[PDB]
Design a protein around this ligand. Structure first.
Ligand SMILES: [Mg+2]
Ligand SMILES: [Mg+2]
Ligand SMILES: [Mg+2]
Ligand SMILES: [Mg+2]
Ligand SMILES: [Mg+2]
Ligand SMILES: [Mg+2]
Ligand SMILES: [Mg+2]
Ligand SMILES: [Mg+2]
Ligand SMILES: [Mg+2]
Ligand SMILES: [Mg+2]
Ligand SMILES: [Mg+2]
Ligand SMILES: [Mg+2]
Ligand SMILES: [Mg+2]
Ligand SMILES: [Mg+2]
Ligand SMILES: [Mg+2]
Ligand SMILES: [Mg+2]
Ligand SMILES: [Mg+2]
Ligand SMILES: [Mg+2]
Ligand SMILES: [Mg+2]
Ligand SMILES: [Mg+2]
Ligand SMILES: [Mg+2]
Lengths: 70, 271, 88, 106, 129, 67
RNA sequence: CAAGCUUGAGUCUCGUAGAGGGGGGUAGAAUUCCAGGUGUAGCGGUGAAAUGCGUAGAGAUCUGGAGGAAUACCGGUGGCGAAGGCGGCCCCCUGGACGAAGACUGACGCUCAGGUGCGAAAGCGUGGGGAGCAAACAGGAUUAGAUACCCUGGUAGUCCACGCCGUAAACGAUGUCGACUUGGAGGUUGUGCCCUUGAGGCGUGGCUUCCGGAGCUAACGCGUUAAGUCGACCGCCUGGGG
């Protein structure tokens, strides 16, 4: 998040590095998470839904690879 | 411990006893005993100046060492004795030069424990040394207001003060009442909380248990006549006025402190 | 826990050889030593229910082994109880 | 008796008496047949974050083969001391007499 | 725990027949060998062989006919939780005489058809069909 | 594709004193990288987490990017 | 009933992983409050607004201090625990599990009516503590009405110690124990080997997700961790309401 201006660095690329570092640290995401209190049931349920969807998309990738269309 | 009595009779049904098995059974130390006759709340004019005091069991005063000025001399605790003259228990410490003294027993103190005094005393419960050497944030008790005057603060059963800061020739103290007060760093103090913290858990149980303690019955002003109390009396239970002392200064909120000489030391008031 | 020298000692005087670690009498002696050891632990860790479960497993295990010895023969059972300090 | 290692951080402005501090502690352990299996005075080091309004410190790591009780008084001397800004005691599975990577680089 | 080793034997034949296994293996016992002998005399199994000394094991060689299991249904009647004993005149006839009922009588473990002509009767171990 | 680094050389624990192979698993904000991206084995990532926590306790390594 | 056997059940030996438990410390980020500096007209909030805070100087920003609670990243249909549950790091005490090669006991086993013990959150008793959050309650909106949803506040409670309570969609809506029955991909933890060459493969265990075969099922589906094939014992059910 802390960025220093190097030599031959215009404001354009300076702000781009700022923004890119913002996602990499993820700071905006974690602020939105703590914006509201979430129940242990709720994080467990959301993570379980996330896990099943990642896994479902995972094997759907191989099934689409192994199937033949037209 | 906290012992609840069985309801063998009324006046024993609600009694809760505080029993300390480590308290010495027998007679106190003779040289350190002195008489204190009772007053009944009466001054040298013979008039009742503080009400609701009278009678109770006869007591003898114990010369308790609040100054703790036997410096550089380690002492060993012999007995933890009951003291009728305070809510805290006392300890008969025997210095290694042959002197016995009464001190306020801290929380962790027991027979055979070593206590010490002076600017080189170790940081340990029962050790007394000035706050310029006591670390900040520690719990201390038996705090003296002026150097050499002897301990005056945190002397009840389970009380203590927190040393929260120090700046130059003063230290800031959080008192058990919950205010911040500045006291000079030359003032001595004893480490640890004072013991017998179960003292507050007892209940007297009877109207006579208070009489043993020298407390006489309190008559409500609203139960009196107009000539006796401002709350006076009417037909039936009447109370149509703001609550006041028997002398017309009204309680239930009126602050009564007026001391501009000592206002400079009170960092914050209680709340 | 019970240490190597502690286990290997009580098995030495409850088992005929130093390799008789499975005899019923040495098992009860091992269990008794560990149970008496944990009494010191639980005299001031009353709220350790998870560990007290393990202690009761050993206590329950010892009762079953003692029951087995009594059914086999009361002679060696009675001798074991006296020398070990149990009642019943 | 088991294998411990203690690293303690002392205030930088009182680094002069730091060498003397090791002898006192090592003498206290050795009097109880404790062993000093590794010593490394790291000396001057800059901190990752400011502790006690200061950004500099004097690091001393040490490894001891010591009884259980002899380290309790060592930790309480750190707690009531003012020289050591921080202290740390850890169990170790075995002895480690080998030097640490950073000191061999420095 | 393990409380009906005879039920274990019958279950292994049934599961081996269903899964088209050539052979099954299982720890041996005298009553187990007697029931295997009954099945072998009766024609329901290919051959049984006992191997080992300290831990014997019955290696049974199952039987098949075309694409179907030879044993249509094998089940246990007398069980540890319910013992069943039958007299001479009340021996059951599994499937109207086209199946066998293993019977432990005084003379030995044997079929209902042979026990009914020996005139003994006894405990009903198993139904084989 | 990616293979764990500490599997290549026999390591018995991750050493907290090290700063090499600790600074690289910390990101620019001071956070510590998941096994997902750094391609390391779950056997050592618990040790790596413990090692990083010990190091940031002793101020060898920073909690955050600032301090 | 008698003697025996080692395959079930255990004991010992060396290790490995783990938010398993109880006690005591400690570190960093953040929130709130107090004291002061700088500074001026807003702040805060919403679908839109208002209550509220502020010219008696707020909010913002900087430096000190108090105090309580939880432990970002790691972090993962990962791990541990009989279940409930357990997440900073360290130390003290302590339980179980699994693996390797042996030694040893010799059916000592499974299940379990009554009984006992453990058992989220909320709640109750006594004494503390109380930053954040927040039943109740208050005010402002919304609405035909709004005892709500939204907003500004806010006490109990949430935190600690010791008791009591014994209830949850306490769920895998699936009792415990044992045996047998085609497969495939993972995760996690051991362990034997192979030119160990190596940043390579072949085996063997424990636990654990996903898909699916036979079979079973009213169907959905379960499918070697069964709801398949079977045995032991226990609990329970008998139309919907009442
Ligand atoms: Mg009065
Ligand atoms: Mg009164
Ligand atoms: Mg009265
Ligand atoms: Mg009257
Ligand atoms: Mg009258
Ligand atoms: Mg009047
Ligand atoms: Mg009146
Ligand atoms: Mg009246
Ligand atoms: Mg009247
Ligand atoms: Mg009237
Ligand atoms: Mg009136
Ligand atoms: Mg008046
Ligand atoms: Mg402000
Ligand atoms: Mg609760
Ligand atoms: Mg309460
Ligand atoms: Mg609200
Ligand atoms: Mg649950
Ligand atoms: Mg229920
Ligand atoms: Mg149910
Ligand atoms: Mg059971
Ligand atoms: Mg499936």
């Amino acid at each position: 998040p802390v960025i220093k201006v190097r030599e031959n660095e215009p404001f354009d690329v300076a702000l781009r590095r700022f923004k890119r570092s913002c996602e990499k640290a993820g700071v905006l995401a974690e602020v939105r998470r703590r914006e509201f209190y979430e129940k242990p049931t709720t994080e467990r349920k959301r993570a379980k839904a996330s896990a099943v969807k990642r896994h479902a998309k995972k094997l759907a990738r191989e099934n689409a690879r192994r199937t033949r269309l037209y | 411990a906290v012992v609840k009595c069985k309801p063998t009779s009324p006046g024993r049904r609600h009694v809760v006893k505080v029993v300390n098995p480590e308290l010495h059974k027998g007679k106190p130390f003779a040289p350190l005993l002195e008489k204190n006759s009772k007053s009944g709340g009466r001054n040298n004019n013979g008039r009742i100046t503080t009400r609701h005091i009278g009678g109770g069991h006869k007591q003898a005063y114990r010369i308790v060492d609040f100054k703790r000025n036997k410096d550089g001399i380690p002492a060993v605790v012999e007995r933890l004795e009951y003291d009728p003259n305070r809510s805290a228990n006392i300890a008969l410490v025997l210095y290694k030069d042959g002197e016995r003294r009464y001190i306020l027993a801290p929380k962790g103190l027991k027979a055979g424990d070593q206590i010490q005094s002076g600017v080189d005393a170790a940081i340990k419960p029962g050790n007394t040394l000035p706050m310029r050497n006591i670390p900040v944030g520690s719990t201390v008790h038996n705090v003296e207001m002026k150097p050499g005057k002897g301990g005056q603060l945190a002397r009840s059963a389970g009380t203590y003060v927190q040393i929260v800061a120090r700046d130059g020739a003063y230290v800031t103290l959080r008192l058990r009442s919950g205010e911040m007060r500045k006291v000079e760093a030359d003032c001595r103090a004893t480490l640890g909380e004072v013991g017998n913290a179960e003292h507050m858990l007892r209940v007297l149980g009877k109207a006579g248990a208070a009489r043993w303690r020298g407390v006489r019955p309190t008559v409500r002003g609203t139960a009196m006549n107009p000539v006796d109390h401002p709350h006076g009396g009417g037909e039936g239970r009447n109370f149509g006025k703001h609550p006041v002392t028997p002398w017309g200064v009204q309680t239930k909120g009126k602050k009564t402190r007026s001391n501009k000489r000592t206002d400079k030391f009170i960092v914050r008031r209680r709340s | 826990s019970l240490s190597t020298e502690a286990t290997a000692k009580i098995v030495s005087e409850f088992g005929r050889d130093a390799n008789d670690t499975g005899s019923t009498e040495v098992q009860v002696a091992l269990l008794t030593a560990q149970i008496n050891h944990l009494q010191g632990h639980f005299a001031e860790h009353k709220k350790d229910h998870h560990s007290r479960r393990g202690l009761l497993r050993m206590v329950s295990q010892r009762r079953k082994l003692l029951d087995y010895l009594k059914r086999k023969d009361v002679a060696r059972y009675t001798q074991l109880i006296e020398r070990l300090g149990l009642r019943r | 008796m088991r294998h411990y290692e203690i690293v303690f951080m002392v205030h930088p402005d009182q680094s002069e008496q730091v060498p003397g501090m090791i002898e006192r502690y090592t003498a206290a352990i050795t009097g109880a047949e404790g062993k000093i299996h590794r010593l490394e005075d790291w000396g001057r080091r800059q901190l990752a974050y400011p502790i006690n309004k200061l950004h500099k410190a004097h690091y001393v790591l040490m490894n001891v083969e010591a009884p259980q009780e002899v380290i309790d008084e060592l930790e309480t001397t750190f707690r009531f001391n003012d020289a050591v800004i921080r202290s740390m005691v850890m169990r170790t599975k075995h002895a480690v007499t080998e030097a640490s990577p950073m000191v061999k680089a420095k | 725990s393990m409380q009906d080793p005879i039920a274990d034997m019958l279950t292994r034949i049934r599961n081996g027949q269903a899964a088209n296994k050539a052979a099954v293996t299982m720890p041996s016992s005298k009553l187990k060998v007697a029931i295997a002998n009954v099945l072998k005399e009766e024609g329901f199994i290919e051959d049984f062989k006992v191997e080992g000394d300290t831990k014997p094991e019955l290696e049974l060689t199952l039987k098949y006919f075309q694409g179907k299991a030879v044993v249509e249904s094998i089940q246990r009647v007398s069980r540890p939780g319910l013992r069943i004993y039958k007299r001479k005149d009340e021996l059951p006839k599994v499937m109207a005489g086209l199946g066998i009922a293993v019977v432990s009588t005084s003379k030995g473990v044997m079929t209902d058809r042979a026990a009914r002509q020996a005139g003994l009767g006894g405990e009903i171990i198993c139904y084989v069909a | 594709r990616k293979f764990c680094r500490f599997t290549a050389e026999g390591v018995q624990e991750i050493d907290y004193k090290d700063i090499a192979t600790l600074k690289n698993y910390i990101t620019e904000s001071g956070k510590i990288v998941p096994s997902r991206i750094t391609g390391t084995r779950a056997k050592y990532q618990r040790q790596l987490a413990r090692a990083i926590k010990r190091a940031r306790y002793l101020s060898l390594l920073p909690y955050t990017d600032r301090h």
